[PDB]
């Protein structure tokens with residue numbers, strides 16, 4: 024009898040082979056309202072197990088591997104480094120004799136090209152076009168080493184190390200974009216490499232940068248067999264809607280179009296046409 | 311009028327102007343106000359090329375020098391040059407692929423993609439007094455992004 | 462011998478300058494001459510690598526100097542001219558040193574301090590640039606202005622930004638420090654904007670049937686936009702005797718980005734095909750597309 028919160032997919036936890044990976048037990052401060060220290064004091068124990076991929080048997084994790092490879096430390100699970108066959112779902116569970124809450128997270132170890140290619144679904148950090156200086160930060164780096172050790176961070180665009188770019192300045196853990204232009208679209212990689220106890224590790228994150236529509240051009244919706252054509256200037260967290268009314272609600276055919284700067288164009292066919300963005304709700308009638 | 315031209319001046323994103331440097335060669339550099347007259351005045355002929363969803367096929371000729379910018383191979387590498395022509399014949403309407411560029415123009419920021427060699431662009435160098443060329447990279451060491459001003 | 466670089470790069474008196482040999486990258490071995498130049502750095506004008514150093518420069522130097530790459534096989538060489546200038550009275554610059562730059566209001570943009578590429582430190586990094594506007598110094602607060610490298614990133618341009626700007630560095634040559642000055646005239650422009658051309662007429666309509674008639678495409682948009690006809694899913698050809706296209710463009714003084722584009726489908730003699738498929742006008746730029754027909 025557990026509270027089975029299931030599988031936390033708000034990881035982005037695919038990970039390259041031969042690299043470290045720490046995972047915090049997702050329970051704490053998320054599923055549960057408390058941290059590790061409190062729960063320990065509350066007489067809870069934290070336990071770990073997994074199911075391998077192409078398997079249904081919940082086995083124990085092995086903590087007695089060569090070089091103390093997979094390690095546990097409080098609410099963190101440590102792989103140093105990950106191997107291919109580590110891929111599967113890991114469960115942390117907190118239990119009393121009267122209490123039980125568990126969740127699991129996916130770990131997908133993945134292989135790398137010499138130029139950063141992989142089946143990895145890259146994450147997308149959109150940048151505002153022509154918008155002064157904007158910065159991207161090398162993701163998932165905190166926890167892997169103390170402030171006592173200064174690593175090397177190398178930035179790449181494509182297969183190429185970023186050195187002497189026109190509007191791009193690597194500033195350590197931060198990559199700076201000066202007045203972005205659509206020329207700035209692509210995959211960017213950070214390779215952070217550090218020493219741990221007389222071994223050197225490497226941490227690799229790659230992400231897609233897409234330059235999109237400025238806030239200073241964001242605007243309520245613009246309206247143009249009866250076509251209701253509406254133009255939606257790009258706004259970041261916006262639900263673009265379009266509907267005909269007659270008074271309340273013959274076929275139809277929606278058609279989303281996008282542009283280079285992600286400005287939406289919903290065309291929808293067939294007496295009044297409406298549109299709603301995060302900046303407005305308007306309507307225009309028909310002849 | 312079989313095609314429309316307009317007469318424009320060009321600069322790159324780091325504000326360098328294009329001047330002609332000894333013929334068959336454009337170079338990009340910063341210019342002082344008393345030498346603004348030294349700018350290559352361009353004629354942007356809006357030719358026919360492949361319909362694109364969002365590009366505009368144009369040919370880039372210099373103004374009464376009877377030269378047009380061109381894209382050809384040279385040691386098996388796409389290269390940008392000035393071909394000379396008979397002005398009674400040009401500005402044609404279906405221009406040969408080595409004349410046509412695809413204009414991408416976003417908030418009045420232009421880059422011209424060679425139609426002959428896709429994913430190649432008119433690049434300038436960050437350095438000064440350095441000749442205009444043709445690059446295989448956007449977003450890197452070379453500037454591929456330009457501004458337009460009219461005449 | 463000679464071919465002239467006839468473009469007189471004017472720089473600042475009492476302050477260090479560097480001139481390179483203006484060669485297309487097919488260069489050789491470069492020697493500098495006056496109207497040769499000393500080879501030892503101590504001499505206030507000299508050669509180091511292949512550049513002509515003025516350490517510092519005084520006004521008396523203004524004149525023509527020569528650079529000569531020689532291969533025995535070839536040695537035709539280039540003459541360049543220099544003008545040095547003391548600052549105008551009550552001014553931290555001189556009018557004919559000014560580089561003109563421009564930017565659009567309501568946008569964010571950046572100026573560039575020209576001819577700074579030679580003053581880098583061994584890591585190929587330049588000296589912190591100090592920014593000024595009309596001899597008064599700038600707050601690089603990263604709200605209104607930011608300086609990285611050779612840039613002066615300016616945010617929310619408005620016409621108040623209009624002025625002569627000054628970028629300044631300090632170069633160390635040989636254990637004495639040297640100041641480098643450049644001047645930029647900031648002049649504003651009309652705002653940049655996402656604008657898709659929009660079609661006026663034809664207006665998706667019928668027209669009664671003839672058997673040398675003209676057919677008009679009116680588009681409102683930029684001059685860099687285009688407006689063309691397609692019929693039977695294909696474009697008007699230069700070798701189609703019935704069908705002609707002539708492209709005109711009326712500017713607009715008021716709003717240059719809202720100015721008439723005109724295309725005429727000069728059909729001359731009808732054919733029976735023309736009643737069967739509509740004539741579509743297309744207005745298009747990088748921002749978006751519009752479409753309109755007339756059926757015959």
Ligand SMILES: *[C@@H]1O[C@H](CO)[C@@H](O)[C@H](O)[C@H]1NC(C)=O
Pocket residue numbers: 057058059060061
């Ligand atoms: C949670 O853990 C921290 C230790 O990092 C501790 O300071 C705190 O008292 C604990 N509980 C809370 C949230 O008060």
Ligand SMILES: *[C@@H]1O[C@H](CO)[C@@H](O)[C@H](O)[C@H]1NC(C)=O
Pocket residue numbers: 065066067119120121122
């Ligand atoms: C069991 O855990 C529950 C929940 O924290 C707590 O109330 C109880 O005191 C714990 N019992 C023991 C003996 O640890």
Ligand SMILES: *[C@@H]1O[C@H](CO)[C@@H](O)[C@H](O)[C@H]1NC(C)=O
Pocket residue numbers: 030075076110111112129130131
């Ligand atoms: C983890 O388990 C889920 C079921 O909850 C399964 O669908 C998925 O394939 C597993 N993923 C990994 C990384 O093994």
Ligand SMILES: *[C@@H]1O[C@H](CO)[C@@H](O)[C@H](O)[C@H]1NC(C)=O
Pocket residue numbers: 143145181209210231
């Ligand atoms: C990486 O960027 C390229 C463009 O440079 C793009 O075509 C590709 O989709 C990206 N990689 C992945 C796997 O998304």
Ligand SMILES: *[C@@H]1O[C@H](CO)[C@@H](O)[C@H](O)[C@H]1NC(C)=O
Pocket residue numbers: 556623624625646647
């Ligand atoms: C810059 O200075 C020059 C000469 O002193 C003057 O002609 C010009 O008006 C100035 N430009 C601006 C916009 O301040």
Ligand SMILES: *[C@@H]1O[C@H](CO)[C@@H](O)[C@H](O)[C@H]1NC(C)=O
Pocket residue numbers: 661679721723
């Ligand atoms: C349509 O274009 C014509 C010129 O062909 C122009 O006179 C007219 O003003 C344009 N339409 C509108 C509504 O301005």
Ligand SMILES: *[C@@H]1O[C@H](CO)[C@@H](O)[C@H](O)[C@H]1NC(C)=O
Pocket residue numbers: 247250252664665741752753754
């Ligand atoms: C005119 O016709 C085109 C198709 O040729 C269509 O896409 C457009 O929406 C029509 N204009 C309107 C608003 O009726």
